[PDB]
């Protein structure tokens, strides 16, 4: 049978470097004279996309800056410079003319670039879902570099715990940051029950930790 | 030139069986046939199979027999697939591919399949007011918060499309209620907020929901 897997699973690399990713088959393509190898791209939230076929060859609308070489049982895709527009996911297949067809594992690659500090927005629960008997207070790191980040609530000045949570953008394809968001979600009674909430951010991009905050009924 | 348009994200119990549709812009699908690929939520792609144009004759990857049938319903150019007994594990993504050369490689946009017994659910949509506390530079921020909904997905639009620029819709998050949540938002010019209206249009097919909030100021 035949199995590929490739290396890395994870790849990041500078803005303007050159990135290689490796795939090898369990056994040799290449004895019927010609590669099959075939590289795909694949975005999020998008299907996958031809980039090379048979191992060297172009795919239709792809840019030079994309490249393979190998045969037998080792390959590699060769892109240089990387672009902002490039993080994505790379996957080898292996097939003929027709299928069947072998994936490999895929590789996640990721655009580095010169560290950015998130901007921070707070904003308050609407009247609407107040009167629901909920209250979300949401939390808005925008735009930074690196992913890591650290975002903590506050209540009254009181660390949050369990009643929170966040989810982080893909890295964006224009200019390779991060946008983050976080929601701390409250009962109308619990919130009625305090006066200030904060959200605390800290991240290799500030030289010290930023707060933003509002009490309950000032706005 | 050639383009696969697939039938909408599905949402069945356990059990159940799911048919989804793959359609050519062309007048059928080339001598190279058709292909079938799953992909579980991030995770990677894996080759289901493929179906012959002309004889019908389907071939399944070994990792997917008994529960999947690809058919042809040359009817009017249009292929199926087909499982049964739904598990978790069928939760994923289907993409449908045909090829008429190294060159003519055409996708769908996919067909999101979500295994559950929980019940379908529109949202509630909420307004994330801009004001003093979402201010920075010249720069104003706000949005819509989505919240407690079922299945996937949801779009979100700006000003009918209108506004795009630095809009932000973040991955939705399950909450313990087993209800999904999300937030939209966008950065405007902050004076332009004497200027301009703000509304984000909500839309959650499979519950036939559409929502218009328009997000208001909040002075504080
Ligand atoms: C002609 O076959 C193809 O188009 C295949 C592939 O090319 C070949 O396998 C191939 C074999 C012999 C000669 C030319 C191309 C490129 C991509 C990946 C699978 C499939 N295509 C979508």
Redesign the interface.
């Known amino acids: 049978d035949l199995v590929l897997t490739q290396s890395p699973a994870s790849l990041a690399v500078s803005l303007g470097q050159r990135a290689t990713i490796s795939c090898r088959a369990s056994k040799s393509v290449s004895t019927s004279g010609y590669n099959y190898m075939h590289w795909?791209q694949?975005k999020p939230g998008?299907?996958?996309?031809?980039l090379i076929?048979?191992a060297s060859?172009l795919?239709?609308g792809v840019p030079a800056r994309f490249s393979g070489s190998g045969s037998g049982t080792d390959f590699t895709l060769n892109i240089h410079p990387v672009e902002e527009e490039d993080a994505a996911t790379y996957?080898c297949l292996y097939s003929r003319?027709?299928?069947?067809?072998?994936?490999g594992?895929?590789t996640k690659l990721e655009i580095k670039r010169t560290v950015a500090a998130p901007?921070?927005?707070?904003?308050?629960?609407?009247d609407?879902?107040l009167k629901?008997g909920t209250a979300?207070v949401?939390c808005?790191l925008?735009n930074f570099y690196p992913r890591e980040a650290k975002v903590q609530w506050k209540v009254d000045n009181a660390l949050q715990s369990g009643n929170s949570?966040?989810?982080?953008?893909?890295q964006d394809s224009k200019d390779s940051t991060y946008?983050?968001?976080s929601?701390l979600?409250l009962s109308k009674a619990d919130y009625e029950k305090h006066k200030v909430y904060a959200c605390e951010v800290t991240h290799q991009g500030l030289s010290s930790p930023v707060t933003?905050?509002?009490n309950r009924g000032?706005? | 030139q050639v383009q696969l348009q697939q039938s909408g994200p599905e949402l069945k119990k356990p059990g159940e069986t799911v048919k989804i549709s793959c359609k050519t812009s062309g007048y059928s699908f080339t001598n190279?046939?058709m292909?079938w690929?799953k992909q579980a939520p991030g995770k990677?792609?894996?080759?289901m199979?493929?179906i012959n144009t002309y004889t019908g004759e389907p071939?399944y990857?070994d990792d997917f027999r008994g529960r999947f049938a690809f058919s042809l319903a040359t009817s009017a150019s249009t292929a199926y697939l087909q499982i049964i007994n739904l598990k978790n594990e069928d939760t994923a993504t289907y993409?449908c591919?045909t090829y008429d050369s190294?060159?003519?490689?055409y996708?769908?946009?996919?067909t999101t399949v979500t295994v559950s017994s929980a019940s379908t659910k529109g949202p509630?949509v909420?307004?994330?007011?801009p004001?003093?506390?979402?201010?920075?530079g010249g720069?104003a921020?706000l949005?819509c918060?989505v919240?407690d909904y079922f299945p996937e997905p949801v779009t979100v639009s700006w000003n009918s499309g209108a506004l795009t620029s630095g809009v932000?819709?973040?991955?939705?998050?399950l909450?313990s209620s087993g209800l999904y949540?999300?937030?939209s938002?966008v950065?405007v010019p902050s004076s332009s907020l004497g200027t301009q209206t703000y509304i984000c249009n909500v839309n959650h097919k499979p519950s036939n929901t559409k929502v218009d909030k328009k997000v208001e100021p909040?002075?504080?």
């Open positions: 795909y694949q998008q299907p996958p996309k031809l076929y048979l060859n795919a239709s996957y003319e027709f299928p069947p067809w072998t994936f594992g895929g901007s921070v927005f707070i904003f308050p629960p609407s609407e879902q629901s979300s949401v808005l925008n949570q966040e989810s982080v953008t893909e946008s983050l968001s929601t979600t933003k905050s509002f000032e706005c | 190279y046939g292909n690929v990677g792609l894996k080759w199979g493929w071939t990857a993409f591919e190294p060159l003519g490689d996708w769908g946009q996919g509630s909420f307004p994330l007011a004001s003093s506390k979402s201010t920075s720069t921020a949005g918060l919240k932000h819709t973040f991955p939705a998050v909450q949540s999300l937030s938002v950065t909040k002075s504080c």
